[PDB]
Amino acid sequence: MKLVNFLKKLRNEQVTIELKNGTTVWGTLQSVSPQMNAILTDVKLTLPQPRLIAMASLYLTGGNIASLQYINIRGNTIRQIILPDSL
Amino acid sequence: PVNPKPFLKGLVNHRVGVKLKFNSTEYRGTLVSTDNYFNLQLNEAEEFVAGVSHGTLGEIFIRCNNVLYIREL
Amino acid sequence: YLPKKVIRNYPGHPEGTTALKFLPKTGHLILSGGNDHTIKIWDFYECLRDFQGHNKPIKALRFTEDCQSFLSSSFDRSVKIWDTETGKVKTRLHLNSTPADVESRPTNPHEFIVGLSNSKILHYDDGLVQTYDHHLSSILALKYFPDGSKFISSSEDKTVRIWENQINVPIKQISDTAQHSMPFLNVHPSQNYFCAQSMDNRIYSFSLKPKYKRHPKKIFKGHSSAGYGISLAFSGDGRYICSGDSKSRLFTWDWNTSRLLNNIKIPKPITQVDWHPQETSKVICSGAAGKIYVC
Amino acid sequence: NGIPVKLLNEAQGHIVSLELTTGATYRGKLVESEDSMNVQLRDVIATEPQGAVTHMDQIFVRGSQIKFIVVPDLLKNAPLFK
Amino acid sequence: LANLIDYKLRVLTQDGRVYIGQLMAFDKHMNLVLNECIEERVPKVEKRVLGLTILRGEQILSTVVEDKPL
Amino acid sequence: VSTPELKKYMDKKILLNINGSRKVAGILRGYDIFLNVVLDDAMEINGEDPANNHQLGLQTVIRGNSIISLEALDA
Amino acid sequence: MVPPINCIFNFLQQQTPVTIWLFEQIGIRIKGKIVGFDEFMNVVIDEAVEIPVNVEKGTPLGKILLKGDNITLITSA
Amino acid sequence: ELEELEEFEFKHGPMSLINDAMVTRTPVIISLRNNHKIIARVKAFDRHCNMVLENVKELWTEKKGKNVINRERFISKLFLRGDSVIVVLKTP
RNA sequence: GAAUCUCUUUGCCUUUUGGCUUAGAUCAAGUGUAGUAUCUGUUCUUUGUAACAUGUUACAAUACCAUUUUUUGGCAGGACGGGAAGAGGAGACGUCGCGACCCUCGCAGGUCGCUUGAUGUUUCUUCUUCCCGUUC
RNA sequence: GUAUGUCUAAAGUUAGCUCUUAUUUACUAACAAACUAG
Ligand SMILES: [Mg+2]
């Protein structure tokens, strides 16, 4: 049905979220919103290869790989979230 | 006064062309189906890159979010 | 939407709370004129102030569209214009008769109409301006038109007279052989209908046309409104009609079929009924108890 | 309703600053704020992203081109502490 | 996020600018209001103090929590 | 949707700036809930220094997703 | 004193040749004749001619349904 | 019966190739807005063309100071926002 | 077998014609304004769970891609750093600072230098020597 | 226009349908171009 409710099955799942600015988030979802807004924990984000804007955002955080205790991401910014292979 | 959903469902089974919003890519093919929200489904799609052909692709879908226009050839 | 539950308390006077109205288009305040005590304002919950300077009960408490000052119609032959912000003395109309409902023209804060019970109506400014003497009986309730510019009067006679902006002569005087009277009346908010209580327990509805004749089947019959000064009400943009009765009951109404919808058993004759101009489903009512039950 | 929109509706009669999504900043007196974050702004002093500074009488920016408004700091005491 | 009320939020907007401020309230559209917000562009360097500002949820990319309250 | 109050700007020479850094002056004839703005006396202000009088009385209309802002030239 | 959906249709009755601008693409414009539209300003246009803004040429494209989300500014000639 | 008018316009509308690729379990190639061509199988389809894929073989392009090289990775499980979706193309 | 309820018919009249004379007598010959009443013409519509003292708080279920928000207008010995000197980075627009000959004078930052202060747009086109830190 | 009829605090009695809108028709007027009532 609504695949927003598919992401609500993914609580405490160790995923890798990729964002629209190229930000690669790696961590575990605590919960997700009905507008796909994803809160996460124990997550360090990389800005893969390039090192060539966004990058500024990564340095904005105590973060290139920076890890933050709690991260809330707007659901409109997600390109694709990779789920654990055992699922 | 051909309104768009009367325009385009009547334009089914015609070799139509669609320019994307990026203008790097166009698609020429027969429009098979179109919903109310203007998603497009083309068969025998030939990709036109910057106005020159890229190659034959086949049964194709185009998201609503990228259709700049659609033309009849 | 329909009121269905008796929600909030609002314990006002232990006396009657004989007048309830709203600020138009800003549902923040109410008014409550009890029998012995003076006017109280409830918010939404809270309370603001008393308005000392009355001795007798109050018929009606009408605002302006400037909304800063309301108009008090007490039984003590005295009309007082009170600010809702400070509560000072603009005028003190010591009158000859016990005044009826005291209203204001929507254009000017100057233009200001006081009904009496010695069959007269007096127009005022910020100070007599023009009399009005065509009713034979004590005048009961008043209205206006969209944005004013004319005026509506009805009495203990069955007559309703549309008077104009400072003109004695009625355009239409509305009378048949079977009408009891028109003791209270409110403008339907599309500003084209004309609803009025009548003591055949029925709420008649006329037009606002030059050919001013009534329309059939829009008559609201199932009441006990015979011996009490009961108010009318209208929802936002005219979806229903609420009206109290003497069964300690509040009765709502449709428009196209005009049939009974909710016969509530609110704990004394329910008289004063107002809607919200903001909340599209809730209705404030008070009878002779003083506890202001909101539906 | 929306609490930020309710916050912005109380900001009428106050001097704000509006930075736009292309980058330009609009400092002016907020008189009329719409429910869709549209704002009528009087006596606006405007600054380009490159630094070109002008003053204008009336500006009216749509919702979806606003980065952020800055309301004056008197608002944060009441009625939005609850 | 209602859990996250009244914390300092290091919130990352669309253009790489980072806002740090105390979360006064949020809504359905993630419109944020920030007490004593500061704005920094290039990443301590290049920061501007704004104060009580709004922040529309159209521009936020992510928000993280900075510190505890008082 | 609330009506965007531009009644103060009716029959007024306003200055719409547009996505792609376009700037178009004109006199307002109408608007809607999507802020789609109708302009009498269309004046395209191009880049260097012409001023393209575009539609002098033929009442152009601009879609609300492309309107950045507007300055009333008069009060 | 004309709301804009009543100001699209007067291009349609009088059948005027119409110049339409795209959205965040300033190099190209489209000119043609308005033949149909909807409530979301998705416009079907007749005799559609591209206008390279940077002498202004044209490639005749004829019938085009231009999707309204790229429509910016509606004029005529 | 709200859902049947939703799902039968879904059936022979433009969502057919996302409905046919999954049923026949045939890989469709997906080109996104940042040129991440994704050839993958479909597990599920959504209203927004949200897609859950399996054995994803994302291929993209990295440009440097000489001949462009091809970078590709295999992703076993993938969830994809429909916003990046431009083209769903089924290969026979 | 004793009796209740509902019908049909009959009987009672049940809101059931309460004076008289010359049928008591005689019947528009306009208009305008207005009022009342009616017809016709015309247009629109069809819940569980937890905590605290019946109430309050928290979390889930039920109710929801078209321009202003969340379903994208997107993409394309050796190294390093700083300061100084010599030989073949510079000009605009603003935005905040170190000095002051200035202004101003009290309890509820404006102006001028910078004598090499910081910083974002926007156009054009490095080597040698010494000193101080980090690394092997 | 009469007859005639009706109203009038100064004084305080003890706890098909819903609708806008115009034409027509009917009955009325001591309302108009110095006076006429049972
Ligand atoms: Mg007689």
What residues of chain D lie within 8 A of the CB of E41, using their CB?
none
For E16, the closest of A20, A56, A68 (CB atoms) is A56
Which residue does chain D place closest to E22, by CA atoms? D76
3-state secondary structure of A82: strand
* Residue E57 contacts A where some CB pair is shorter than 8 Å: yes
Residue B32 exposure: Cα atoms within 13 Å on the Cβ side: 17
> Chains with 3 or more CB pairs closer than 8 angstroms to H?
A, B
Nucleotide nearest to C218 (CA to C1'): J18
Identify whether the C-beta of residue F66 lies closer than 8 Å to the C-beta of residue G72. Answer: yes
Beta bridge partners of C71: C62, C81
CA C45, distance to chain mean position in Å, is 24
Fill in the DSSP letter of residue F8: G
Q: Which tokens go with A5? A: 């409710």
User: Would you say the C-beta of D7 is within 7 Å of strand I?
Assistant: no
Tell how far the Cα of C176 is from the centroid of ligand 1, in angstroms: 30
CA of H89: how far to CAs of B63, D68, H15, in Å? 11, 41, 12
State the Cα–Cα distance between residues C24 and C66, nearest whole angstrom.
9
Which residue does chain A place closest to H56, by CA atoms? A82
| Window 4-63 of B, Cβ < 8 Å to G | 4-8, 11, 21, 23, 38
Tell how far the Cα of C136 is from the centroid of ligand 1, in angstroms: 30
The spacing between the Cα labelled CA in A61 and the C1' in I25, in angstroms, equals: 115
Protein residue at shortest CA distance from C1' of I122: D50
What's the structural domain count of chain D?
A: 1
Identify whether the C-beta of residue E54 lies closer than 8 Å to the C-beta of residue E43. Answer: no
Task: Say which amino acid occupies A52.
Answer: L
Q: Which tokens go with C237? A: 């943009």
Q: Which tokens go with H88? A: 């769903």
For E61, the closest of A19, A55, A62 (CB atoms) is A19
- What's the burial of G1, exposed, middle or buried (CB within 10 Å: 0-12/13-18/19+)? exposed
Contact G61 B68 (CB under 8 A): no
In units of Å, what resolution does this entry have? 3.7
Give the CA angle between residues F46, F48, F52 to the nearest 5°. 30
Give how far D41 is from chain F: nearest CA, Å: 10
Q: Which tokens go with G25? A: 């693409």
Tokens 């949200």 correspond to: H50
Tell how far the Cα of E58 is from the centroid of ligand 1, in angstroms: 94
What's the structural domain count of chain B?
A: 1
Contact H88 B20 (CB under 8 A): no
* Residue H59 contacts B where some CB pair is shorter than 8 Å: no
Closest listed residue to residue A40, CA positions, set A5, A67, A1: A67
| Other Cβ atoms closer than 10 A to C227 | 10
How do beta strands C283-286 and C293-294 pair? antiparallel
* Residue G21 contacts B where some CB pair is shorter than 8 Å: no
Nucleotide nearest to H62 (CA to C1'): I76
User: Would you say the C-beta of C211 is within 7 Å of strand J?
Assistant: yes
CA F71, distance to chain mean position in Å, is 9
Contact E64 A72 (CB under 8 A): yes
CA of H57: how far to CAs of A71, A84, H45, H72, H83, in Å? 28, 16, 18, 7, 19
The packing angle between helices H16-24 and H2-11, to 10°, is 80
Identify whether the C-beta of residue C207 lies closer than 8 Å to the C-beta of residue C254. Answer: no
* Residue G36 contacts B where some CB pair is shorter than 8 Å: yes
Contact A74 E61 (CB under 8 A): yes
Tokens 């991440």 correspond to: H36
Can you give the residue ranges of every domain in chain A? 1-87
State the Cα–Cα distance between residues B23 and C72, nearest whole angstrom.
72
* Residue G4 contacts F where some CB pair is shorter than 8 Å: yes
What's the structural domain count of chain C?
A: 1
For A53, the closest of E15, E43, E63 (CB atoms) is E15
State the Cα–Cα distance between residues G70 and G72, nearest whole angstrom.
6
Give how far G42 is from chain B: nearest CA, Å: 7
Beta bridge partners of F69: D61, F17
State the Cα–Cα distance between residues H81 and C243, nearest whole angstrom.
55
Q: Which residues contact A42 (CB under 8 A, 6 or more apart)?
A: A27, A28, A67, A69
The spacing between the Cα labelled CA in G24 and the C1' in J38, in angstroms, equals: 95
Give the CA angle between residues E17, A67, E6 to the nearest 5°. 60
Closest listed residue to residue F55, CA positions, set F29, F75, F32, F73: F29
Count of B-G CB contacts under 8 Å: 51
Q: Which residues contact B25 (CB under 8 A, 6 or more apart)?
A: B47, B48, B49, B54
Closest listed residue to residue C234, CA positions, set C223, C248, C220: C220
Residue A8 exposure: Cα atoms within 13 Å on the Cβ side: 8
Tokens 């912005």 correspond to: D8
User: Would you say the C-beta of G22 is within 7 Å of strand I?
Assistant: yes
3-state secondary structure of C80: strand
Nucleotide nearest to C192 (CA to C1'): J20
Q: What does the DSSP assignment read for G20-40?
A: EE-SS--SEEEEEEEEE--TT
Closest listed residue to residue C81, CA positions, set C43, C114, C107, C55: C114
3-state secondary structure of D62: coil
Contact E54 D21 (CB under 8 A): no
Q: According to the entry, how was the structure determined?
A: cryo-EM
The CATH number for F1-75, chosen from 3.30.565.10, 3.40.30.10, 1.10.10.10, 2.30.30.100, is 2.30.30.100
Q: Which domain holds residue C236?
A: 1-295
Q: Which nucleotides of J are covered by protein (CB under 7 A)?
A: 8, 18-22
Q: Which among B63, B68, B73 is the top mutation candidate for probing chain G, defined by the most G β-carbons within 10 Å of its own β-carbon?
A: B68
What residues of chain A lie within 8 A of the CB of E7, using their CB?
none
Contact B70 G61 (CB under 8 A): no
What residues of chain F lie within 8 A of the CB of D32, using their CB?
5
User: Would you say the C-beta of H12 is within 7 Å of strand I?
Assistant: no
Q: Which domain holds residue B62?
A: 1-73
Can you give the residue ranges of every domain in chain E? 1-70
Longest alpha-carbon distance in chain B? 36
Count of H helices and E strands in chain D?
Answer: 1, 6
State the Cα–Cα distance between residues A17 and A40, nearest whole angstrom.
10
Identify whether the C-beta of residue C196 lies closer than 8 Å to the C-beta of residue C203. Answer: yes
State the Cα–Cα distance between residues C76 and C58, nearest whole angstrom.
8
H1-92: what CATH class? mainly beta
Contact B2 G44 (CB under 8 A): yes
Q: Which residues contact A1 (CB under 8 A, 6 or more apart)?
A: none
Task: Say which amino acid occupies D57.
Answer: D
Q: Which domain holds residue D31?
A: 1-82
Count of A-H CB contacts under 8 Å: 40
User: Would you say the C-beta of C207 is within 7 Å of strand J?
Assistant: yes
> Chains with 3 or more CB pairs closer than 8 angstroms to C?
none
